Design a protein around this ligand. Structure first.
Ligand SMILES: CC(C)c1cccc2c(-c3ccc(C[S@@](C)(N)O)c(F)c3)c(C(=O)O)[nH]c12
Ligand SMILES: [Zn+2]
Ligand SMILES: [Zn+2]
Length: 232
């Protein structure tokens, strides 16, 4: 009822949306992995009379539920989606999106990693993002490659109209003490990549992590701290 959704408020198999700013929502869904249940976020950005989706809802049925929730709550068509790295919480559901007519996009690095992992593969390659510090425009957002962090391919997304920074899985929520699933991370480079984010987007007003609650700029330094505590 207005608080940021968690697993305890999302009915089984459903998705919730949360209004972040004018024309900006996050989407929240729950999934089980290796016997534990996790929340995950994505983003929705209004693009005139269409919508841009960032990240799937972590699985085929969750992503179908996401599309239905969007139609119920917003009622504008999702025409494009970007996945911000190759893990299932970002691409699992891309087949559902594609079959619904959504054009799906990711960097070439994410596409290669997804294919090699056996994960669903976005259709279209996003060039211009292969070097740390690169940025490109995509509809109403900027896509930025900060360098290796949670994964070597992770992208962040900035919504300039609202000063919303969607960090994806390179950014952790404030309540975290641990650094999440680091199987594919570069813990040594992650703080440098976070520093690049901080330098590029110093006016961000909302920071959204890939899992957990949004907050402010503090999420960036906090993420560096938790990653360093893990590495130690
Ligand atoms: C490879 C993908 C599909 C995957 C599977 C299972 C879990 C994760 C996580 C993850 C794990 C723990 C926390 C809470 S803590 C931060 N306190 O450690 C968490 F927030 C996330 C992440 C992630 O970190 O993105 N990915 C996961
Ligand atoms: Zn991941
Ligand atoms: Zn993640």
């Amino acid at each position: 009822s207005g608080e940021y959704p968690t697993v305890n408020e999302i009915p089984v198999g459903e998705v919730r949306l949360y209004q972040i700013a004018d024309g900006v929502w996050s989407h929240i869904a729950t999934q089980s992995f290796d016997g534990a249940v996790y929340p995950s976020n994505g983003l929705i950005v209004r693009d005139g009379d269409e919508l841009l989706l960032i990240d799937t809802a972590w699985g085929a049925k969750n992503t179908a539920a996401l599309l239905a929730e969007i139609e119920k709550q917003i009622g504008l068509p999702v025409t494009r989606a970007v996945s911000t790295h190759f893990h299932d919480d970002r691409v699992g559901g891309v087949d559902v999106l594609r079959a619904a007519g959504v054009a799906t996009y990711a960097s070439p690095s994410t596409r290669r990693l997804a294919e090699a992992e056996g994960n669903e593969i976005p259709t279209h390659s996003l060039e211009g993002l292969s070097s740390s510090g690169d940025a490109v425009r995509f509809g109403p957002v900027e896509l930025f490659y900060p360098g290796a962090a949670h994964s070597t391919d992770n992208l962040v997304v900035y919504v300039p109209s609202a000063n919303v920074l969607y960090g994806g899985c390179a950014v952790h929520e404030l309540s975290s003490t641990s650094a999440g699933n680091v199987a594919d991370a570069d813990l040594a480079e992650w703080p440098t990549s976070v520093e690049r984010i901080q330098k590029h987007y110093p006016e961000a007003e909302v920071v959204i992590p890939g899992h957990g609650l949004p907050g402010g700029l503090d999420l960036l330094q906090h993420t560096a701290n938790v990653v360093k505590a893990h590495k130690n």
